[PDB]
Symmetry: C3
Subunit: 163 residues, 3 copies
Amino acid sequence: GPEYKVAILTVSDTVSAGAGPDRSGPRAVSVVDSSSEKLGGAKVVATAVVPDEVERIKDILQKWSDVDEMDLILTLGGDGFTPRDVTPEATKKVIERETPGLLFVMMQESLKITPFAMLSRSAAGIRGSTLIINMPGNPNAVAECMEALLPALKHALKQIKGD
Amino acid sequence: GPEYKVAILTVSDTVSAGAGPDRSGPRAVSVVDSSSEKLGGAKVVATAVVPDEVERIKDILQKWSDVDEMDLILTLGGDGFTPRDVTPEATKKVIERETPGLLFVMMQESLKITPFAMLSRSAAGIRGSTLIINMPGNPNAVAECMEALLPALKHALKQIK
Amino acid sequence: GPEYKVAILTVSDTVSAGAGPDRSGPRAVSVVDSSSEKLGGAKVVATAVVPDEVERIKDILQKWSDVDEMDLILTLGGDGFTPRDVTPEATKKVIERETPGLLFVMMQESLKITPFAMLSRSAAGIRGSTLIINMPGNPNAVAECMEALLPALKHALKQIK
């Protein structure tokens, strides 16, 4: 049905251990939907929760990319300065081609709102035909991050397939 | 005898195949010449064309750096999201010392012109005493990128030798 | 004593051989001290000078991180385009988790002051529970870089603990 399949990985010890709810997953989904027209028709067809563990993050990024053939994975959380935050390290081991322009833009735009944006260690890139983008664990962040990328994200996904 | 030898690598399956003229290469050459003075006396002295294949891109960057001792190599194309675009991966395998400043400036300035600038995956860096910089395929791109780097690129090349 | 232990590493062949003095080390100390409160109570407890030799630089970043357990390490110098400048390459070998937002902000702010800021190749990241940040060898640079990081640097040190 969906022209582009999006999947959202929430990374969090707290959430994964049933000790707290997911306040960001839902917004991410809600933001992608509300942005479906401008993304050339996209839909979240899968979410998942993993803890802050590199192997668990890699396995899902691999599985969603290689086997389920997602076209766009957003991760949420595990991207800051805390000892446990290893999402970007996990992400870099699985992507094949980096997309530093997406990171440049998420950082430029977030900094306009607050200087604490400089504590995001986001990575991004392509594996096979899958665009993978790290985003912070705040609910508001996915909205701000997605507002910054949307002008170009449609053309990006089209480009990864065959323009 | 130019003070800084520059070399321009066009990257493109199409152009390498003969299937179409090289639109970007000549323009780039013409840009560099026109900025010769501002760059401390640099001139293009070689170009080449390769398809979108990492090994081929590596060989030329390696040969130009290690053997011809080029001072500045600009690559054009192969830097986007399309599956064959592999210039930056090729580049990353041959540089020894990254120069993220140059990537930040190219990206900051091109983004003022258009948000589609975020789709360049340019890499850049230094191998031996050769500065290498990925720029996009558009003929207009090279000139915009060059205008962005021009204030410091003379001092960059002098610092290297 | 100090809530955050800070050490400052000056990387320069000139200084390390005794052939010149260190004009940036003092300034760096003076800036950290002057911002102690905004940094959540921080103090420079150690400085050291090394030449532009990767192993020498690695050894101190490792020692200060694994053994002396510093909370913040600033390096000054060895970060530009000169053949000897290898601070970032030594830095990249020892960090575990990169911190590119810090690099982005240092570059964004320094460019506002001069286009020559694009020539810093600084690196930054985390080894264990030490934050390591490359800055340039200019005295004025440390002040400019620290002014740019200051709004978040306290929260960064809190989060690593």
